Design a protein around this ligand. Structure first.
Ligand SMILES: Cc1cc2nc3c(=O)[nH]c(=O)nc-3n(C[C@H](O)[C@H](O)[C@H](O)COP(=O)(O)OP(=O)(O)OC[C@H]3O[C@@H](n4cnc5c(N)ncnc54)[C@H](O)[C@@H]3O)c2cc1C
Length: 425
């Protein structure tokens, strides 16, 4: 039934061999968990989605990995209740396509739509709209969770079982296997955005633009960030902010199908600086999703809002480090949710991408130290190399979480490389 496969995260690193069960049959999945649970705990099992996490959370060296992607049935979409009832293996692209004709919008979209609902819940994913909509877990109204004892529990965010619900959110598959879930969607009259763009000249401007109160006028907001240039150019950004369009705001050419989907010699001189300011500055531009969205070590952290000087310092440490990240996504996160292991907290969030090079491993450890000291944290979906000590200090509700985890899996039936590395087992 199960194939001995060699798995990595998206980052393609720290590989381990696991037995991969790949079946559309939910009964064969309940029975595999039943089959891991009688052998004491062994090296346990972990669910896997589309494998878009960069780290080691969806692999289990010498254990069972359950590929959930065949479980990809959309059960119902209701435009009156805004509810979708889907298998955990459906991905967000599939869901977005299916839901559009109902005037329904996926409430949190990450950078790639090739992620499963299970992965979205287990990493409590965030998107361009976090400050206004929170993260993925905020919009789950129920889920069905295959736990260690082979029973399927029906969890809701409030009432009985809320605790296990909120431990599952952001729990990296370590509470069991999400089989099915109900998501509340965001109503929309169009598949379009109305976007405003701005280009800042420095880090100070970027931060200033995100604290001048303008952010409250936008539901969606993110920025491409300069992390290579020396000050004052360091931290200059192309900001893209917006909100879903209404049909009255579409041009006539689009208004009849409102929900349908489908370096020269100047470049680094003053004419290019002008061109790029001009091209990046705009108001009320109508965009579809693709236009509005757009050997390596991926690293993402958030620093709490107040610690602005500390955030500025970390960015300085980054550019003077001799490690050059060209692709950097910046955003200001809004209020957190009640999940103990949820990554997002209100504050300055950035994702960087370092070429793998001599000194890099030791430099990001130092980064960890700084991020930790400044009260922020790393994102498990990007990580495969931080220590359990650092992680546990970054997430002070980890003991709270672990304690919930030991109630629901005393025999450690669910386990992964990440769980063992970060001592979440
Ligand atoms: C190009 C790119 C851009 C990205 N942008 C963003 C972004 O903007 N915001 C953001 O928050 N993230 C982003 N991510 C990270 C990604 O959204 C998460 O890593 C997500 O969890 C991946 O989903 P997956 O289905 O691929 O799950 P996998 O990577 O296969 O697994 C991820 C985790 O979820 C658990 N899991 C999966 N299915 C289940 C299940 N059925 N039951 C229980 N647990 C399960 C796994 O055990 C594992 O712990 C990005 C990733 C990439 C590659």
């Amino acid at each position: 039934t199960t194939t001995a496969t060699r798995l990595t995260g998206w980052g393609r690193t720290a590989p381990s061999v696991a037995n991969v069960l790949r079946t559309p049959d939910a009964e064969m999945i309940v029975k595999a968990v039943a089959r891991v649970a009688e052998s004491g705990g062994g090296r346990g099992a972990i669910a896997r989605g589309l494998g878009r996490s960069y780290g080691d959370n969806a692999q289990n060296g010498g254990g069972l990995v359950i590929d959930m992607t065949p479980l990809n049935t959309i059960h119902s979409i209701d435009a009156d209740t805004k509810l979708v009832d889907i298998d955990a293996g459906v991905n967000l692209d599939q869901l977005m396509k299916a839901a559009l004709p109902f005037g329904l919008w996926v409430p949190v979209l990450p950078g790639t739509r090739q992620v499963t609902v299970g992965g979205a819940i287990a990493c409590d994913i965030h998107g361009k709209n976090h400050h206004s909509a929170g993260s993925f877990g905020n919009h789950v109204r129920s889920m069905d969770l295959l736990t260690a004892d082979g029973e399927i529990r029906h969890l809701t965010p409030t009432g009985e079982d809320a605790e296990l619900f909120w431990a599952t959110v952001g729990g990296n598959g370590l509470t069991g296997i999400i089989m099915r879930a109900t998501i509340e969607m965001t109503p929309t009259s169009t598949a379009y955005f109305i976007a405003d763009g701005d280009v800042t000249a420095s880090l100070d401007e970027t931060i200033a633009l995100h604290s001048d109160g303008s952010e409250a006028r936008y539901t969606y907001s993110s920025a491409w960030f300069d992390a290579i240039s020396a000050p004052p150019k360091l931290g200059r950004a192309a900001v893209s902010r917006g909100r879903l369009a209404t049909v009255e705001q579409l041009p006539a050419k689009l208004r009849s199908e409102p929900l349908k989907f489908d370096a020269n010699k100047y470049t680094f001189g003053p004419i290019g600086e002008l061109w790029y300011r001009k091209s990046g500055t705009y108001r009320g531009k109508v965009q579809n999703l693709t236009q509005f969205y757009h050997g390596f070590l991926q690293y993402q952290f958030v620093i709490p809002t107040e610690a602005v000087d500390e955030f500025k310092k970390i960015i300085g440490v980054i550019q003077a480090s001799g490690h050059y990240s060209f692709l950097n996504v910046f955003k200001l996160f809004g209020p957190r949710n009640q999940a103990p292991l949820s990554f997002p907290i209100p504050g300055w969030n950035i994702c960087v991408d370092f070429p793998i090079k001599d000194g890099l491993g030791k430099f990001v450890s130092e980064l960890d130290r700084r991020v930790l000291e400044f009260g922020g944290r790393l994102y498990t979906a990007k990580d495969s190399r931080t220590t359990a000590e650092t992680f546990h200090a970054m997430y002070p509700r980890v003991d709270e979480w672990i304690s919930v985890r030991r109630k629901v899996d005393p025999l450690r039936v669910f386990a992964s490389d990440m769980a063992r590395r970060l001592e979440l087992l």
